[PDB]
Design a protein around this ligand. Structure first.
Ligand SMILES: Nc1ncnc2c1ncn2[C@@H]1O[C@H](COP(=O)(O)OP(=O)(O)CP(=O)(O)O)[C@@H](O)[C@H]1O
Ligand SMILES: Nc1ncnc2c1ncn2[C@@H]1O[C@H](COP(=O)(O)OP(=O)(O)CP(=O)(O)O)[C@@H](O)[C@H]1O
Ligand SMILES: [Mg+2]
Ligand SMILES: [Mg+2]
Lengths: 209, 195
């Protein structure tokens, strides 16, 4: 009634705690990978730059040689990092749009999309969740529907980004990606609804603004 | 089970995106700076050596600090030293012997390092002497117990050697840590968890 509160909050608290443990586990895993790559390179840079400083007067040529070495190892280390950052990032929704056009065309399914109410600003996290859901919704159309047409709408409506994926095929079986998407969306305080009357239509919403 | 699995995967992902931004900014920037300054510094070796030296002291500082955090996160991590020794002994046994191990978390860095040293020596002895063709690491009550068994033949004489040898070395080091070493029919080493 009003204890429903005390409870929802103990729930909030435990979720947060579980949260920081998983979070930390990941942070450490990454810290080990970084030490394992960049570690020796950074130490080397330090050493050589120190040695080089020592040789400025004594052996200018040897110092320049050393600084060339420093330059190379800093360059390549910077690469390791660019790669990692890119890898750790996600898929932009505009890029996923292009992937699904290619996939639907390759499957001989008509793709209907017109940009309307494109989100003004969405968090990179929520954008990446939506990209993942959009990919799966279309994988399902291709694998199961036997559709000839697929309609995708991506709109900012009220305080949500709403994606609808509809097809004119037939829904297969009775009550995996559907639970996967719903769980991912619900974790983001979003929702997933499915209508299987005239083919299959997925409505996925996630908060924004 | 997945219910909790896949949610935790979502938290990791988020975390992963966050670290990604942080890296980009801090470390990516520090490496670019290092490159720049080291290049400028090279340019000044002859024309302005004093400047070149200052630049180089700076590069030194930014390289040293560059992984501080990472270094810290890994510095306070328990399980690693022994987890790395596990990898070394797999390599050594393969280069020599079938290795049988199945994962079975909390100790002290000191006691972990003592165990790594003993594990290395136990396996060096297997490789050098046994002519063998199994390692257990378990947290039992308030001890960490490591067993290293082999299917070769024991080569030791009536006496259990002395100074300059690993068996006495391991026993002495373990016993000083309030641990134990027992041993040849067909090594059990224990150390207290926190002390
Ligand atoms: N667009 C669509 N059209 C027709 N049937 C669909 C559909 N999307 C899903 N289905 C039906 O719902 C079922 C469950 O879908 P879901 O995505 O969860 O698993 P799946 O069969 O695609 C394997 P996975 O998702 O692990 O790749 C499918 O097996 C299919 O019968
Ligand atoms: N796993 C094993 N299998 C067979 N014999 C072993 C063995 N471990 C030890 N031994 C025997 O016990 C003896 C004493 O071992 P110990 O480790 O103390 O010295 P060592 O011969 O390895 C030189 P050091 O230990 O200084 O490197 C060995 O010389 C060998 O005969
Ligand atoms: Mg599916
Ligand atoms: Mg020995």
């Amino acid at each position: 009634r009003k204890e429903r509160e005390r409870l929802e909050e103990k729930l909030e608290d435990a979720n947060e705690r579980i949260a920081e443990l998983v979070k930390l586990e990941e942070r450490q895993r990454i810290a080990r990978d970084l030490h394992d790559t960049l570690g020796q390179k950074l130490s080397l840079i330090g050493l050589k730059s120190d040695l080089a400083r020592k040789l400025i007067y004594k052996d200018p040529e040897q110092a320049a040689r050393e600084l060339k070495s420093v330059q190379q190892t800093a360059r390549t280390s910077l690469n390791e990092v660019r790669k990692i950052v890119s890898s750790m990032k996600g898929i932009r929704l505009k890029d996923e749009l292009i992937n699904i056009k290619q996939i639907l065309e390759a499957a001989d399914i008509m793709f209907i999309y017109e940009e309307e109410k494109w989100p003004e600003n969405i968090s990179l996290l929520n954008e990446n969740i939506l990209s993942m859901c959009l990919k799966e919704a279309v994988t399902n159309v291709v694998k199961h529907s036997q559709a000839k047409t697929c309609r995708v709408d991506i709109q900012q409506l009220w305080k949500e980004v709403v994606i609808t994926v509809s097809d004119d095929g037939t829904f297969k079986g009775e009550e995996h990606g559907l639970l996967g998407m719903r769980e991912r969306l619900e974790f983001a305080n979003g929702s997933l609804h499915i209508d299987t009357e005239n083919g299959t239509k997925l409505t996925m919403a996630i908060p924004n603004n």
